[PDB]
């Protein structure tokens, strides 16, 4: 923790995985894996050792009335 919260914030702004501020984080991870762009096997291995926490399993701007 506090290092796992920057890896996800770095996965969320890389443009080669998609334009993602409307959906979940694991849905975008599986969308890129289907098309197989290059999802890395570390943004998966922190979404498995946690429960349904809203500060891991949510996009950066899931507040913010946009």
């Amino acid at each position: 923790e506090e290092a796992e919260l920057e890896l996800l914030r770095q996965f969320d702004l890389a443009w080669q995985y998609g334009p993602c501020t409307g959906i979940t984080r694991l849905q975008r991870w599986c969308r890129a894996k289907q098309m197989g762009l290059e999802p890395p096997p570390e943004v998966w291995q922190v979404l498995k050792t946690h429960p349904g926490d809203p500060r891991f399993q949510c996009s950066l701007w899931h507040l913010y009335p946009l």
Binding site: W15, P19, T21, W61, Y64, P65, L66
Partner: protein, 107 residues
């Protein structure tokens, strides 16, 4: 305080009588159900047409068609008029699922 403890009391679409069970129509107003389905799908149809004209206008005012919109401009009518149609559509879509589905989906 008390406002949170709503029992989600359902109501008849025809004559507004609260009753037990989830069916949309009332037992006295059941014959006129094709007309009551006809009524309100022309409302869902007009909310669908308003969602699409607004959420693609932000893409042309922003410049790009491939990246997210971030513009909370308080002097634009576009902002917060694009926020309420999501909820109107959220509500009007769920009122028509009182009626069954028009077919299967797992075939």
């Amino acid at each position: 305080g008390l406002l949170a403890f709503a029992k989600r009391r359902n109501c008849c679409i025809g004559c507004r009588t609260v009753l037990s069970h989830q069916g949309a129509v009332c037992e006295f107003c059941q014959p006129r159900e094709s007309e009551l389905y006809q009524k309100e799908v022309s409302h869902l149809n007009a909310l669908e047409e308003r969602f699409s004209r607004l959420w693609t206008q932000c893409q042309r005012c922003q410049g790009s068609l491939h990246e997210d919109v971030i513009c909370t401009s308080r002097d634009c009518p576009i902002f917060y008029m694009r926020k309420k149609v999501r909820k109107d559509l959220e509500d009007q879509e769920q009122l028509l699922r009182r009626f069954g589905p028009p077919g299967p989906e797992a075939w």
